[PDB]
Amino acid sequence: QPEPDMITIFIGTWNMGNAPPPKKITSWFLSKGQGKTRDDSADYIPHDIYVIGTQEDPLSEKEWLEILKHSLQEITSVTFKTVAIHTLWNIRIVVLAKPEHENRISHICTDNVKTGIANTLGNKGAVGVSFMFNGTSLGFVNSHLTSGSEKKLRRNQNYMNILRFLALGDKKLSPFNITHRFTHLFWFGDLNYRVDLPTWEAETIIQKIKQQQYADLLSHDQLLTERREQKVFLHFEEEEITFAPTYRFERLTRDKYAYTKQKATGMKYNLPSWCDRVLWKSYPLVHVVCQSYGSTSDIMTSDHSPVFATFEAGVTSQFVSKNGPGTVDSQGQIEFLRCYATLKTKSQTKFYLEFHSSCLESFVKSQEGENEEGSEGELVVKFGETLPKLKPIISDPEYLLDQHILISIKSSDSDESYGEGCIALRLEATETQLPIYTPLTHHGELTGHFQGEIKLQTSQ
Ligand SMILES: CN[C@@H](C)c1ccc(F)cc1
Ligand SMILES: CN[C@@H](C)c1ccc(F)cc1
């Protein structure tokens, strides 16, 4: 029975509004309703992995697991295995997989982050799960960010705290946060970004939604505008939104947006908004295609509608050769020519590089680079031809061309990372000098760039 080179992943996000769900929620798992929906001809085809994020979830883990499993069983006639479940307050993540994947899934991690201080610590934050699927690392984050139209900066701060402190994936990847630890990272939840239009325009917005004319609303969506200005979710992708705003509905219908200020809202307006979102980030030149992104129309227990997204994702096999794992393959090497880092830092320490990859026995430390002043005020760290030759565990090109090298640039003085990035080994040619590039981030903010040339030798 051959190992897969693709899997499909279902991502669901639903703020349940502290109410139990209705008896049928199958439309969510089938990607049916509004937006980019799944073809009817696929209804019996199970996804390989289902990841369910809830917020304001009033159910026990047991109660929710029973509803989810019985839902998937009805759709697919498959009894799904529970990979992981993790809850922080009323924020929950469930990962379910087809039973045939049980012995493909390992290194299962869960964590949570509580956002805010004092006043603002006690119900917002994130949960996450990571695991390996054969040779591919998968991470999943469900976050409930700060509410309120005038708190987009707080949401952006919540995002930075979550990606700094959520402890998922391979702990040996010590310089890297969750935005570099996974082949594929999915980040979803009630992110709570709003449509920033005046309160007086509420009925105009409702009109626009009834016409299915979303363009003038999306141009004021705080998550789209913050992402454009590089304030949040740098280097993440989101599928185009073609469904109505998922918040705030009167319960038991979808015919009415409840936007007016009430004692129950803290006298805040809730203009119709796309609070409920799915984003992703995959390593360079790995296959990932969004195949659905939408909301259900028939689940009306909450003031939010459920959101679904599905993805095709490239995966690789757990490779063994006569040499690696447990030794190098002298027939393989990775060389770096004319490399330099450009950093936004005002500091003057020496810097060195660390190379981390599951194609190496352990990470590799470079010598210090030579600092020069760039012509526009920047720090340029030149490595020239001085970077070590990397010795992969397996030289087979069917393995090596599917790998990635994570790069951290670190201060000699403090050993703290100033910048992290990733290079694909999916090259146009082997034994050939080719340009490489990655942006560098730290705490998920742009800090610089790394560029140069690579030369990859495989056994072929
Ligand atoms: C051995 N660990 C259990 C939790 C497990 C369950 C499902 C799966 F796909 C992989 C592992
Ligand atoms: C990450 N891709 C960039 C081009 C982008 C930024 C904001 C946005 F709303 C859509 C795309």
DSSP notation for 12-28: EEEE-TTSPPPS--HHH
Q: d(Cα 51, Cα 219) in Å, to the nearest integer? A: 29
Category of 448 on φ-ψ map: left (φ > 0), alpha (ψ -120 to 50) or beta? left
Separation CA 134–CA 6 (nearest Å):
11
Radius of gyration of the chain (CA): 23
Q: How was this structure determined?
A: X-ray
Instruction: Say if residues 48 and 8 touch (Cβ distance below 8 Å).
Output: yes
373 in the same domain as 292: no
Q: Does the beta carbon of 228 sit less than 6 angstroms from any atom of ligand 2?
A: yes
Query: Helices marked H in 134-240 — which ranges?
Result: 152-165, 178-181, 202-210, 215-218, 222-228
As a whole number of angstroms, the distance between CA 446 and CA 376 comes to: 17
Nearest ligand 2 atom to the CA of 221 is 9
139, exposed or middle or buried, with CB in 10 Å at 0-12, 13-18, 19+? Answer: buried
CA 108 – ligand 1 centroid, Å = 8
Instruction: Look up tokens 């493909």; give the residue.
Output: 104
The amino acid sitting at 49 is I
Closest C-alpha to 110, from 136, 147, 145, 82 = 82
Ligand at shortest distance from the CA of 226: 2
How many angstroms from the chain centroid is the CA of residue 417? 21
User: Does any ligand 1 atom lie closer than 6 A to the CB of residue 359?
Assistant: no
**Do 221 and 369 fall within a single domain?**
no
Question: How many Å apart are CA 7 and CA 315, to the nearest integer?
Answer: 7
- Alpha-helical (H) ranges within 30-110 are 61-76
Angle at 449 between CA 445 and CA 450, to 5 degrees: 135
From the alpha carbon of 102, which atom of ligand 1 is closest?
A: 9
Ligand at shortest distance from the CA of 129: 1
Q: Which atom of ligand 2 sits closest to the CA of residue 225?
A: 9
103 Cα nearest atom in ligand 1:
10
Contact between 253 and 373 under an 8 Å Cβ cutoff? The reply is: no
Both tokens assigned to 323: 């040499």
Do 237 and 378 share a domain, yes or no?
no
Handedness of CA 32, 34, 38, 39 (dihedral sign): positive
3-state secondary structure of 209: helix
Resolution value (Å, 1 decimal): 1.5
CB environment 392-426: b (16+ within 10 A), e (fewer): bbbbbbebbbbbbbbbbbbeeeeeebbbbbbbbbe
168 Cβ below 6 A of ligand 1 = no
Show Cβ contacts of residue 46 under 8 Å, excluding neighbours closer than 6 positions: 72, 75, 76, 78, 80, 98
* Tokens (6 digits) for 318: 């757990």
- Residues with Cβ within 8 Å of 174's Cβ and at least 6 positions away in sequence, in order, are none
Q: How many domains does the chain have?
A: 2
Q: Which ligand is nearest to the CA of 233?
A: 2
Distances (CA, A) of 150 to 28, 94, 192, 417: 30, 31, 11, 33
- Separation CA 416–CA 274 (nearest Å): 38
Two tokens at 26? 């199958």
Please return the burial class of 34, using the count of CB atoms within 10 Å of its CB with bins 0-12, 13-18 and 19+. Answer: middle
Residues 292 and 309 sit within 8 Å (Cβ to Cβ): yes
Q: For residues 112 and 192, what is the distance between their CA atoms, to the nearest angstrom?
A: 18
Q: Given the structure tokens 């007086």, which residue do they identify?
A: 200
Token pair listed for 373: 């002043």
Query: Distance between CA atoms of 243 and 34, rounded to whole angstroms?
Result: 5
Contact 298, 25 (CB under 8 A): no
Which ligand 2 atom is at minimum distance from the Cα of 236?
A: 1
Phi, psi angle pair for 71, to nearest 5°: -65, -55
In 362-402, beta strands by DSSP E:
364-368, 370-373, 379-384
Distance (Å, whole) CA 26 – CA 28: 5
Burial category of 160 from C-beta neighbours within 10 Å (exposed 0-12, middle 13-18, buried 19 and up): middle
Mutate to test the pocket of ligand 1, among 47, 50, 65, 81 (most ligand atoms within 8 A of CB): 81
CA distance 134 to 137: 8
Residue 82 CA: which ligand is closest? 1
Per DSSP, the three-state class of 40 is helix
Cis peptide before 164 (omega within 30 of 0): no
Burial class (CB in 10 A: 0-12, 13-18, 19+), 200: exposed
Structure tokens given for 152:
């987009």
Ligand 2 atom with the smallest distance to the CA of 223 is 9
Cis geometry, peptide bond prior to residue 248 (ω within 30 degrees of 0): yes
The DSSP code for 120 is G
Task: Name the closest ligand to CA 134.
Answer: 1
The number of CA neighbours under 13 Å toward the Cβ of 306 is 27
| Nearest by Cα to 382 from 335, 447, 336 | 336
Ligand nearest to the CA of 97: 1
* In a shared domain, residues 174 and 266: yes
> Do the Cβ atoms of 310 and 186 come closer than 8 Å?
no
| Identity of the residue numbered 29 | F
321 and 426 share a domain? no
Domain boundary among 325, 355, 388: 325
What letter does residue 287 receive in the DSSP assignment?
A: -
- Residue 116's Cβ-count burial label (10 Å; 0-12, 13-18, 19+) is middle
Handedness of CA 211, 217, 219, 225 (dihedral sign): negative
Distances (CA, A) of 411 to 343, 351, 420, 450: 12, 5, 13, 15
- Residue 23 C-alpha to ligand 1 middle, in angstroms? 28
Task: Pick the residue whose CA is nearest to atom 2 on ligand 2.
Answer: 237
Rounded to whole angstroms, the Cα distance separating 354 from 116 reads: 33
Given a contact cutoff of 8 angstroms between Cβ atoms, the answer to whether 59 and 67 are in contact is yes
**Which of 193, 223, 227 most suits a substitution to test ligand 2, by most atoms within 8 Å of the C-beta?**
227
- The strand ranges marked E within 123-258 are 125-133, 136-144, 184-190
Residue nearest to atom 3 of ligand 1 (CA): 83
Mark whether 85 and 173 lie in a shared domain: yes
Sign of CA dihedral 129, 288, 238, 215: negative
Same domain, 387 and 409: yes
Of 301, 325, 349, the domain-final residue: 325
Give yes or no: residues 88 and 50 share one domain: yes
What distance in Å separates the CA atoms of residue 195 and residue 222, rounded to the nearest whole number? 6
Q: Is the CB of 234 under 6 A from ligand 2?
A: no
Instruction: Report d(CA 128, CA 360) in Å as an integer.
Output: 27
Tokens 């951290």 belong to: 408
- Does 224 sit in the ligand 2 pocket, CB within 6 Å? yes
Nearest to 220 by CA among 274, 170, 258: 274
Which of 102, 130, 131, when mutated, tests ligand 1's pocket best, judged by the most ligand atoms within 8 Å of its CB?
102
Of the residues 303, 325, 347, the one at which a domain ends: 325
| Placement of tokens 């980040």 in the chain | 187
CA angle 74, 29, 194 (to 5 degrees): 150
Question: Which residue, by CA, sits nearest to atom 8 of ligand 1?
Answer: 102
Same domain membership, residue 295 and residue 441: no
Helix or strand run (H / E) with residue 398: helix 397-400
Residues 259 and 349 reside in one and the same domain: no
Residue 310 parent element (H or E)? strand 307-314
For the purposes of burial, counting CB atoms within 10 Å of the CB of 29, is it exposed (0-12), middle (13-18) or buried (19 or more)? Answer: buried
Which distant-in-sequence residues (6+ apart) come within 8 Å of 318 by Cβ? 3, 134, 135
Q: Sheet containing 81-88: which strands, arranged edge to edge?
A: 34-36, 288-295, 307-314, 6-15, 49-55, 91-97, 81-88
Q: Do 77 and 191 lie in a common domain?
A: yes
d(Cα 214, Cα 244) in Å, to the nearest integer?
7
Cα(411) to centroid of ligand 1, in Å? 40
Q: Judge contact between 28 and 67, C-beta under 8 A.
A: no
Domain that holds residue 426: 326-460
Please tell me whether residues 386 and 251 are part of one structural domain.
Answer: no
- Span from the CA of 316 to the centroid of ligand 1 (angstroms): 19
DSSP 3-state assignment of 119?
helix
Query: CA neighbours within 13 Å on the CB side: how many for 214?
Result: 15
Half-sphere exposure of 261 (CA within 13 A, CB side): 8
